[PDB]
Design an enzyme around this catalytic site. Structure first.
Site, PDB file in Angstrom:
ATOM      1  CG  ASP A 124      -3.024   1.382   2.904  1.00  0.00           C
ATOM      2  OD1 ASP A 124      -3.679   0.612   3.650  1.00  0.00           O
ATOM      3  OD2 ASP A 124      -2.938   1.226   1.672  1.00  0.00           O
ATOM      4  NE  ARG A 128      -3.563  -4.289   3.988  1.00  0.00           N
ATOM      5  CZ  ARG A 128      -4.224  -3.302   4.589  1.00  0.00           C
ATOM      6  NH1 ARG A 128      -4.447  -3.342   5.895  1.00  0.00           N
ATOM      7  NH2 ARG A 128      -4.672  -2.270   3.888  1.00  0.00           N
ATOM      8  CG  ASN A 129       0.087  -1.573   4.269  1.00  0.00           C
ATOM      9  OD1 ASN A 129       0.147  -1.990   3.117  1.00  0.00           O
ATOM     10  ND2 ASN A 129      -1.072  -1.358   4.851  1.00  0.00           N
TER      11      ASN A 129
END
Length: 248
Positions: A124, A128-129
């Site tokens: 992932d 945004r992570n």
């Protein structure tokens, strides 16, 4: 891990994400990020901190601890004043130098290097992570078709070379100040474009040495993609010689 008396909830910005202070006995009071919160959902909430607790790196979010013996359940992680990297960059479009953006990427690749070295596949990896602090230090969090490698979409093959592909999309995200990869293409249009040799165009003002590194991250064959150690070496050679970032 942590006694509730050491925790003090100040503001709010599975459950709720909060801001607060942490003062452990025989230690200084430090500003922290406190997440709060079903048997299966309680097992999933605390599992993130179990994976996170196994990591000790300046570019991976540090877990101060966990509160289980009391209500509510708390995940106490280090505080990141500037939040998510994608929105942080969007709010600062064209505000940082090329060196400052390459610094952020060197930070992400170093945390990703540590994780890969620990036999961990993130799956992932995206802007945004990635979390950011007042020092502009970028740290990997959260332990996504337009970030996923082709082989991983096609035959569910996930490795640190599929994370290198994701890193290449983050590289594009950073150099484009957090804009949407493939803009308004559908998830299926991206899959077919990627399978028919299409690769995201270089963002405006992006150096040739940075665009080529993204291209290496996106090599169809995963064994031909650079490893995270090689990426860090490449970005360090660029910070050391800022002339290599002049050609667009």
């Amino acid at each position: 891990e942590i006694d509730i008396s050491c925790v003090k909830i100040e503001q709010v910005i599975f459950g709720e994400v909060c801001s607060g202070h942490l003062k452990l006995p025989g230690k200084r009071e430090i500003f922290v990020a406190i997440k709060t919160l079903t048997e299966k959902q309680r097992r999933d909430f605390l599992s993130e901190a179990s994976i996170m607790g196994q990591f000790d790196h300046p570019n991976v979010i540090h877990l101060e601890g966990v509160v289980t013996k009391s209500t509510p359940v708390m995940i106490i992680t280090e505080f990141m004043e500037n939040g998510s990297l994608d929105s942080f960059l969007r709010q600062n479009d064209g505000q940082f130098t090329v060196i400052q953006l390459v610094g952020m990427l060197r930070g992400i690749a170093a945390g990703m290097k540590y994780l890969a070295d620990m036999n961990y596949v993130h799956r992932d990896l995206a802007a945004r992570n990635i979390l950011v602090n007042s020092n502009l230090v970028c740290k990997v969090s959260d332990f996504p078709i337009r970030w996923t490698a082709p082989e991983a979409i096609q035959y569910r093959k996930f490795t640190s070379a599929s994370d290198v592909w994701s890193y290449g999309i983050v590289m594009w995200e950073v150099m484009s100040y957090g804009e949407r990869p493939y803009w308004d293409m559908t998830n299926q249009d991206v899959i077919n474009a990627i399978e028919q040799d299409y690769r995201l165009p270089p963002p405006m003002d992006c150096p040739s040495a940075l665009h080529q590194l993204m291209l290496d991250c996106w090599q169809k064959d995963r064994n031909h993609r650079p490893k995270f150690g090689q990426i860090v070496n490449t970005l360090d050679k660029m910070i050391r010689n800022p002339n290599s970032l002049k050609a667009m």
